Design a protein around this motif. Sequence first.
Motif, PDB file in Angstrom:
ATOM      1  N   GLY A  12      39.421  38.529  37.854  1.00  0.00           N
ATOM      2  CA  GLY A  12      40.494  38.901  36.958  1.00  0.00           C
ATOM      3  C   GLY A  12      41.843  38.765  37.625  1.00  0.00           C
ATOM      4  O   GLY A  12      42.091  39.389  38.658  1.00  0.00           O
ATOM      5  N   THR A  13      42.723  37.945  37.054  1.00  0.00           N
ATOM      6  CA  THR A  13      44.020  37.721  37.679  1.00  0.00           C
ATOM      7  C   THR A  13      45.035  38.775  37.261  1.00  0.00           C
ATOM      8  O   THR A  13      45.720  39.352  38.112  1.00  0.00           O
ATOM      9  N   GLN A  14      45.147  39.039  35.964  1.00  0.00           N
ATOM     10  CA  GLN A  14      46.018  40.089  35.455  1.00  0.00           C
ATOM     11  C   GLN A  14      45.263  41.408  35.514  1.00  0.00           C
ATOM     12  O   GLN A  14      44.325  41.625  34.743  1.00  0.00           O
ATOM     13  N   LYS A  15      45.667  42.281  36.428  1.00  0.00           N
ATOM     14  CA  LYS A  15      44.960  43.534  36.637  1.00  0.00           C
ATOM     15  C   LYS A  15      45.938  44.565  37.174  1.00  0.00           C
ATOM     16  O   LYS A  15      47.125  44.292  37.355  1.00  0.00           O
ATOM     17  N   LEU A  16      45.417  45.763  37.414  1.00  0.00           N
ATOM     18  CA  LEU A  16      46.216  46.825  37.993  1.00  0.00           C
ATOM     19  C   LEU A  16      46.520  46.509  39.456  1.00  0.00           C
ATOM     20  O   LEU A  16      45.772  45.773  40.105  1.00  0.00           O
ATOM     21  N   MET A  19      43.766  47.514  41.743  1.00  0.00           N
ATOM     22  CA  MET A  19      42.553  46.712  41.692  1.00  0.00           C
ATOM     23  C   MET A  19      42.651  45.427  42.499  1.00  0.00           C
ATOM     24  O   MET A  19      41.752  44.587  42.396  1.00  0.00           O
ATOM     25  N   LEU A  24      34.721  41.997  42.498  1.00  0.00           N
ATOM     26  CA  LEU A  24      34.003  42.438  41.311  1.00  0.00           C
ATOM     27  C   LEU A  24      32.811  41.528  41.068  1.00  0.00           C
ATOM     28  O   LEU A  24      32.980  40.338  40.789  1.00  0.00           O
ATOM     29  N   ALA A  44      32.247  47.053  41.954  1.00  0.00           N
ATOM     30  CA  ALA A  44      32.900  46.737  43.214  1.00  0.00           C
ATOM     31  C   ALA A  44      31.857  46.538  44.304  1.00  0.00           C
ATOM     32  O   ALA A  44      30.719  46.997  44.196  1.00  0.00           O
ATOM     33  N   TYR A  68      38.569  53.676  50.998  1.00  0.00           N
ATOM     34  CA  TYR A  68      39.391  52.563  50.553  1.00  0.00           C
ATOM     35  C   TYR A  68      39.285  52.325  49.059  1.00  0.00           C
ATOM     36  O   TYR A  68      40.036  51.502  48.525  1.00  0.00           O
ATOM     37  N   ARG A  72      41.529  54.130  43.430  1.00  0.00           N
ATOM     38  CA  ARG A  72      41.283  52.936  42.645  1.00  0.00           C
ATOM     39  C   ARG A  72      40.510  53.282  41.379  1.00  0.00           C
ATOM     40  O   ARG A  72      39.685  54.198  41.379  1.00  0.00           O
ATOM     41  N   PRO A  73      40.760  52.580  40.278  1.00  0.00           N
ATOM     42  CA  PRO A  73      40.028  52.867  39.028  1.00  0.00           C
ATOM     43  C   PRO A  73      38.663  52.190  38.974  1.00  0.00           C
ATOM     44  O   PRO A  73      38.413  51.253  38.213  1.00  0.00           O
ATOM     45  N   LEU A  74      37.738  52.681  39.790  1.00  0.00           N
ATOM     46  CA  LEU A  74      36.403  52.111  39.902  1.00  0.00           C
ATOM     47  C   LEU A  74      35.369  53.112  39.415  1.00  0.00           C
ATOM     48  O   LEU A  74      35.379  54.274  39.830  1.00  0.00           O
TER      49      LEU A  74
END
Lengths: 95, 95, 95, 95, 95, 100, 100, 100, 100, 100, 100, 100, 100
Positions: A12-16, A19, A24, A44, A68, A72-74
């Motif tokens: 994914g290129t456009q991400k937070l 992230m 992924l 992840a 780490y 992060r939104p994982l």
Amino acid sequence: MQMAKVCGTVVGTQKLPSMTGVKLLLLQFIDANGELLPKYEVAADPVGAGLGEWVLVNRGSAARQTEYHQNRPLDAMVVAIIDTVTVNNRRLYGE
Amino acid sequence: MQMAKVCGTVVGTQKLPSMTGVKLLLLQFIDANGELLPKYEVAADPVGAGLGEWVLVNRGSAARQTEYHQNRPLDAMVVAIIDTVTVNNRRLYGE
Amino acid sequence: MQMAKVCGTVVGTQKLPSMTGVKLLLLQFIDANGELLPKYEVAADPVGAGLGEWVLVNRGSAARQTEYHQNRPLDAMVVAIIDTVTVNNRRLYGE
Amino acid sequence: MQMAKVCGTVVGTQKLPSMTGVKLLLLQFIDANGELLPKYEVAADPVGAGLGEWVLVNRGSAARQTEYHQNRPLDAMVVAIIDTVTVNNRRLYGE
Amino acid sequence: MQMAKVCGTVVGTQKLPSMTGVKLLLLQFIDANGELLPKYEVAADPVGAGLGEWVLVNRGSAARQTEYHQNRPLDAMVVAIIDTVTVNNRRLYGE
Amino acid sequence: AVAVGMIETLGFPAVVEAADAMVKAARVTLVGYEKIGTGRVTVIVRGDVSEVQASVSAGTESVKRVNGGQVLSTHIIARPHENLEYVLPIRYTEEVEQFR
Amino acid sequence: AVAVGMIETLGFPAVVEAADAMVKAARVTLVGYEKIGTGRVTVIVRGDVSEVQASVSAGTESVKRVNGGQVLSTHIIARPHENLEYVLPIRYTEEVEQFR
Amino acid sequence: AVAVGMIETLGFPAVVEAADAMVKAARVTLVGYEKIGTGRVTVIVRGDVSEVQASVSAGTESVKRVNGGQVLSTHIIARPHENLEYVLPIRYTEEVEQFR
Amino acid sequence: AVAVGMIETLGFPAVVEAADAMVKAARVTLVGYEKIGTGRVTVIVRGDVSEVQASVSAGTESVKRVNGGQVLSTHIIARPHENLEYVLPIRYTEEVEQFR
Amino acid sequence: AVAVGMIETLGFPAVVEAADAMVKAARVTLVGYEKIGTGRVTVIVRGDVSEVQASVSAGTESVKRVNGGQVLSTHIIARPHENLEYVLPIRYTEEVEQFR
Amino acid sequence: AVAVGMIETLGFPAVVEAADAMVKAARVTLVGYEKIGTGRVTVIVRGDVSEVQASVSAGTESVKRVNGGQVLSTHIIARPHENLEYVLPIRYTEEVEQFR
Amino acid sequence: AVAVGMIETLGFPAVVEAADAMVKAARVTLVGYEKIGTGRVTVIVRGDVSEVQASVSAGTESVKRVNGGQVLSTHIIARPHENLEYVLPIRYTEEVEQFR
Amino acid sequence: AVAVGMIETLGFPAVVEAADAMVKAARVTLVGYEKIGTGRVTVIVRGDVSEVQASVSAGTESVKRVNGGQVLSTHIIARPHENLEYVLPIRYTEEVEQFR
């Protein structure tokens, strides 16, 4: 944790900004026998898992407990690459 | 994370004061192949996702980790707009 | 919590450093009647559970509440080895 | 978040002291088309939702993020009363 | 929350030291009408629930919010004994 | 008689993020793009006030995730006068009638 | 399925400015006028909940133009119960069914 | 659609000095007299806003020449909505049609 | 012989949030609306005390989410005397017999 | 030869919470209720020691969710002597044989 | 399927006022009277848990009218086990089966 | 030759608890309900002066159960004059001659 | 339905002075004598509430003229429930019917 098989990867290129740098994967869940379920999970991957590997994937807030991945939104992470599964005292995923 | 397709938007006028300014999408989940599942999720959207886009949506406490969703009652969020899925070393969602 | 039966053990050699020393079982979920469901879970095991034993397994962030599983990426744990289930005021798993 | 229809009300007098003053609804989940699923959820209700309303309900720890639900044992809350759903750029729940 | 019926109890002798003194029930989930689903949950019980009684059970981290279940590995708890359910402005579980 | 929402930013990449997150958040139509000097750029949306209130509010925290872009001014007008259509540049043009 | 919005002001010149700027802002109708004592005067508007929030937010900030007029409490209810129509003075009367 | 002026005083002898200096300072018509509690009394006039603006501003400075009487709030509405006359007590009654 | 719940708030928009969250949180019937001066407004409900206890306790926590509105007093009477209905304004009126 | 559990509280509503949360936690039979003075009340359960250990431990954490109720003492005896049933009031009576 | 509520007070005038205000407040039946020693006296009411919670809440605050009467412990059990009726003195006696 | 007893509370939930606990305490009948302004609400009971003193003493201490409810003034008159029956609202009405 | 008065003292010679000065002060009948432990003894009188209020109040300052005797608790109940007669030991016995 759930046993899962690494089918592929997701880019994914456009991400937070949190992230960035998070690898992924695309895991498909396997049952207790080892047949692929029709359930998947993009997870992840801190420990490097290749395609076709059997991994252990945990869901929820447990994916953010490794210093780490904390802020992060994982909600999924590969915690272990499965070496062997022994069911009913006999080997199942020896290799 | 789960791969999902942005079907539409949900607009709520009477809501909590913590929910103001949160863009609520209507994502339909897709499988590993790419066919739409009969499972949906209304998710927050920090990265701007348009209709028909494939996104990565995470559930639970991970939707509240991005410094502006921390004290918000969110259990789903779009963390990435999917650029490429590569299943079994061949491309699936290149475009 | 869920009642589950220990079918076997899962060993992973390549894993996170937080996952070292964690005994990973392979539990199969049973119903209230006592028959095995087609749903499984790889769970941590602080209390020593043997093969075929009925255990109580909890999912989520509750697996990280026991003084040494705190900063570990665990979403399942065996909290109890089941002694007796008494459904409808009659014994079911006495033994 | 999930779209749900307020089917009814659940009242319990013998409860925890943290659960006093919490309005417990009885929501039935609706699909993306808009018809009722055979899945329900008893949810807290800070924003006043009437019978027959379409609401947005979130599950998990996100129900405890609203300044008074923090130390309450809630795993579901009504965060929004749905005003409009626009699926495939056409209106679905305008009214 | 979910409405559930207390079918029985689960007794575990070999368990964690955090799990001592926790009363473990065996709840079977009911639907919106009131018929028993084939889904169950072993839940903690601070509010004393008898056999056959309808209770409200919450899942996840919300089971650890009541000042003595805080550092316990609980992912389910009985928060309320249901007094009445009123679906579509008519009584369902009055008694 | 149709609601007008306006988000005024300082900068052009901040106002395209404002204009794009507005038409994506709710069924509104971006009809206007107004430059008034000193780097102040306004985008104008039209639609029902359930959509315009949701889009303008979601459009404000989208500019906040742009570096160097601020929201100087924002407003929603629920039922404007018909005098405002002819004088102010907030009306539906011919190019944007397909999104009405 | 129409919302109800209330603005309680301290003073009658403060509540006519609140009532005038509420029906001018959006597509709501003023149906009510309730005095509860101690100079607390409430006006009641009815409309769709997007129109009502756009009215009450406009009528709240409109009472700063009235010198010596204070806003005490405002509230917006998305759909009031059918029980509230007959007990509380929030229902549509026959003077204001031409504005619906 | 005729302008409404309101002067709210604390006290009845202050509000008759309000009401009489309003109808004398300009060609307006006193149509209303409103008690809302805690000694707050409102005087409502109607007329063209050429009159009512001079009527209210000269009516406000006349209450200041009463001992113990002050003006709590005052306001002029130049073009009210037609919804306001049926709900609020600001309309022309039958007794005051000779002064319109 | 049917239970009476009362919530007394300071203000009318707080008391409609009281009255609506009472009839929504449980199967109760709003039968009363009482003004006693100094901005004190009381909402009276009837029903079984399984309902009215949950109705009052959830109705009390809803007034706390209104700006400027607070609960002054609240009470539940589980089994009132039959003398109370003829004197106090807590009885079922004719308009609210469809919600009993 | 059947295990005896005893929870001693200070107070009678504390010991009914003790006696009921014991028989609800596990398959035990409440056979005894013993008063020894100074407000010390003991309830006695019988059953298999898997049930009695779980019930007495769960019955102890229930008395401390009562206001003013404490647990003075608590003991489980896994296999008593047969001498104890004829002297001490811990034996199965005729009334409680249906719950054995 | 009827709940049991207990109020333990220190003193016999405290326990008759607690017993009188419990059967007056709601539809419960006083069935029990148990002295455990040291001046700790308990009354036991029976009814469904809606009325029992409203009785114990009323009977607890009713013992402040009694000078020198203290409330030591109160508890409400929503559904007692069938074991408790034969051992603990909470069951319906035949003297109070006319009040059920 | 019947006494009159009054309890003035601050609040309507405080005065229904005062009225309910007065007719429950002794053999008096509630005949009156008088609001005098500023949230001062009075209930009036009639009976023999022994029954009235037992009611007013019970109804005074019963308003501490109402949070935010205060007792302002109570008084018991042994036999009121015949003049007071027609002027003050303390007389027996036809709604409450079934309770005499 | 007949009034119950109770005087609880610490000691037996204090409670016979309480019981003797009660039946001498007014036409009441001593029907009860209750021991609850820790030296707390209660005497129970019955009669019309004019007699019971006078006897209990006169009985309280009679214990104050005994050395080493205090009144721990005292109460008068003007109209008890008929449920209280069968459970509590406050009823008329057969021996004390000649003093009724």
